[model samples]
Target chain A: TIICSVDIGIKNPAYTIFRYEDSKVSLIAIEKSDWSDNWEYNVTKDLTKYNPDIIVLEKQGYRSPNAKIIYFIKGFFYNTNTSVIVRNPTFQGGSYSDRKKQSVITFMDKLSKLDDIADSFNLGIAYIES
Target chain B: TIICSVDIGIKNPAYTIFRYEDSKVSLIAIEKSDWSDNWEYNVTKDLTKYNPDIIVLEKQGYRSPNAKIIYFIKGFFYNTNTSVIVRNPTFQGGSYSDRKKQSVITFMDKLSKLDDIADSFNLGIAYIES
Candidate 1:
């Protein structure tokens, strides 16, 4: 299965796409895209272009304006047949620091450099583990 | 201005459309639409068919899976040119009971019979007042 894991934010949205095959996954692409006023448009626009089989979203609490974009993300997919889902962010891999840290050793500094992107990485892995 | 105000609910979704001319609003249409499995799709589909210039959405807390449709509403409008906005439900005009009742006096029993549609009516009035 192909997956795109997303960490949604108002100004720091991020995503990672990977191909899971034979119980192993390979990174397809990842980015911490700049949030435009119409970021969800382009973010989704950018996302569907990859045509991942499933979308894994990191759960976001509706604590800030960022919550609105979560709606936008769901809204965008409501029309299309694409599978969009939220992944639980657990402390299971250890502490928050250690778990997020571990999703990246496979990507080295590539996916490890950004917090949003790193969170996106973890959601994808959690979906796999689940 | 042409407006469709919606009261979001899991099963009892409702809407009221109106034309605002010379600073007074007149009801054009209203309904407590039965939500389909793809309710947001048809709710919006049914809405745009009227060609309302704007959509008035009541603020919804993401307290239910129903909240996901609010995002669908936003997402549908995101891809299109129609204006979708939220109308605050205020205690003004009276307590919730009186205020909701007042919004429908303009329409009599037509808009008054249902809770969701009555709330939808109030939201449109709130936008007009604001």
Candidate 2:
């Protein structure tokens, strides 16, 4: 199965595409999208290129007003029959209480363990920047 | 002049709208927008009610992909001639490098000190929930 996970943000969205087969998973792509004038349209359009079976997203705060764009993109994926999983932002120290204390790599590391398939998967470290 | 600042996010966007006149800043509103299917439309519409002279936003991660919606809302404000300021997300400890270690209140406390108008402002702390 082909799985994709995103560290979703509006400035630079990071995506990891991997193919899981048998007991091993191989990284296919790790990408960061640049800013665009037509961001929603472009991000949604680009998803078709990968045609991932499932897409994982970080769940936004219940009280946050920034969730609109995140959900807007999710709506596009939903229309395309792509499943989306929203994970709570958590860390080894426990929950994400502060934005000043964590790094993207560490967040991704914790996220990699959230699901069964991602637990043992290998991330192409170099491509994980930003 | 009435000024507003936002810690923009797709999950929970924090807004602080204040009346700035003479050297005093009094909070008019400190609100968090709820998620909606029509987020961009609603947020833009709401700004009309406040008729703020300027709206301040957090400058997003240069490499993060979550900027689409944030910019999208900014577009709406731009259309209305409401000036938007994008500030860097920083803390007394320094920049926001970790999400799991910062509290929203602390973030806002730091943000309250960012601009000239906001320096001596009062944030109606009661309305800051979410």
Candidate 3:
């Protein structure tokens, strides 16, 4: 199964695709694109090419101005038959000072993409095997 | 003094212009225009013609998707040298179920334009004589 995790922001949101095989998960790609009028088009194209079975997005507060963009992207993925999950930011890996959560080290060992993967791992939602 | 009050919305926003003179306030114009890409330009032009001393707006919750439009309009007025004030919805006259609030009575009292004027009155902000 493949899961794509995203950290949505106002200007540049992050996208990390992960593939699970042989009982292990591996990082496939990381996309951090700038925002523009054509943002939806580019994100749609990239997500289409990746074609993950599930897309996980870090949920933002409804009061935040960034909510519209997050809603728009989620709607697009939903319309295209992609399964999307919105996880609250609180569920992300806790700060390095905490002992309960390992500080972004358990995943594919790539520093650049570590934070993004940590977000998916700490999704707070139960992961069911298919 | 001239005060313009707006009821901002995602699709079709409402604009009402009020002029104060001789210790009395009168409705000068009521605009309920449709929304479009050029909405900002159109609104700016209309507001410029009115040249209000103060612009009043109905404030929406931060979580509401309509907040951006309200913020945008307020910013435009701010940039021009017009004073803008955003008031909470609760300050508006209460429903007919109660008294004291007067359920859109009083003022110039045009039924269609009554509600908008009541909003400006219940602004929850103290009015100052200039």
Candidate 4:
């Protein structure tokens, strides 16, 4: 079960989603401030799917009705906590998304329980998202 | 491990499989019933690999000892549960094999004890469906 932040309506990119029985969503919101418009590092299809014990898309807002035994996603967005800025106008190196990363870490901590549920529910963790 | 329900040989479509720790399969017998073909939607490269607790290709008559692990895919072609009908000849939309929304469910379900074995076996799930 690999849950991705990519919309269900678009052409799927790469298949980075790793395991299966899972709802996992990881989105690496890169700063447009960094790469040029042509930057191809976007999650691609790989980002779209991942094996997760559960997909936390709603906080990030990823929804799927057909996934009967997995987790869910939230379309997450964020606001910075401090006064920080992208150094480069078009190449905002890797230091951005204070929001996305915090959210992911938070989610991961919460989902750690998945390892347990997976054990009890006859489940396993999936690698979805970023 | 995510296993593909696709033809043991050819361009595969997507979704079709993941939760892949277990070996599960189902395929579409598109109406292209046969498409002229190329509207696009190819499996992309996600084709060559997938997460499979095990992918047994030979048992289903999909291959010889040349394959195992996968439950066996032998180019699954349904007998046509038709009373059915396809309106478009070009799209060759769906209504394919009864593969799971994320067939990995089959694998996860089967590997039901995966967590137990995964831990004891020191394993985790993978979503690469080739």
* Model 4 complex DockQ against the native: 0.01
User: Across residues B25-96, which tens digit of lDDT does each residue of candidate 4 receive?
Assistant: 333211111111331112212323343333222121223221221111211111111110111111123553
Ranking by lDDT: 1, 3, 2, 4
Clashing pairs in 3: none
Candidate 4, residue B103: the lDDT equals: 33
TM-scores of chain B alone in all candidate structures, in the order given: 0.76, 0.64, 0.65, 0.20
For each candidate in turn, the TM-score is 0.70, 0.38, 0.42, 0.16
- Reference contacts recovered by each candidate, as fractions? 0.51, 0.00, 0.11, 0.00
Question: What lDDT does the true structure give each of the candidates?
Answer: 0.71, 0.52, 0.57, 0.23
Separately for all candidates shown, the number of backbone clashes (residues 3 or more apart, or on different chains) is 0, 32, 0, 81
Candidate 1 per-residue lDDT, tens place, A1-130, comes to 8888887766677888889999887888888776757776676686787887788876666555555667667767765667778755633566776866655554465444566677787678778776
Model 3: residue A130 alpha-carbon error in angstroms: 9.6
| Candidate 4 global CA lDDT score | 0.23
**Tens digits of per-residue lDDT for model 4 on A65-114?**
21111111111111112111111111123654643354345446644312
- Candidate 3 chain A worst ten-residue window by lDDT: A121-130
DockQ of 2: 0.03
Q: B11-82 in candidate 3: lDDT tens per residue?
A: 555666777788776667766554555554555665567888887776676687566555545544533468
Candidate 1: CAPRI quality band: acceptable
Candidate number with the higher TM-score (2 or 4): 2
- The candidate scoring highest on lDDT is 1
lDDT score at residue A60, model 3, on the 0-100 scale: 68
Q: Model 3: runs farther than 4 Å from truth?
A: A21-23, A90-130, B1-62, B65-130
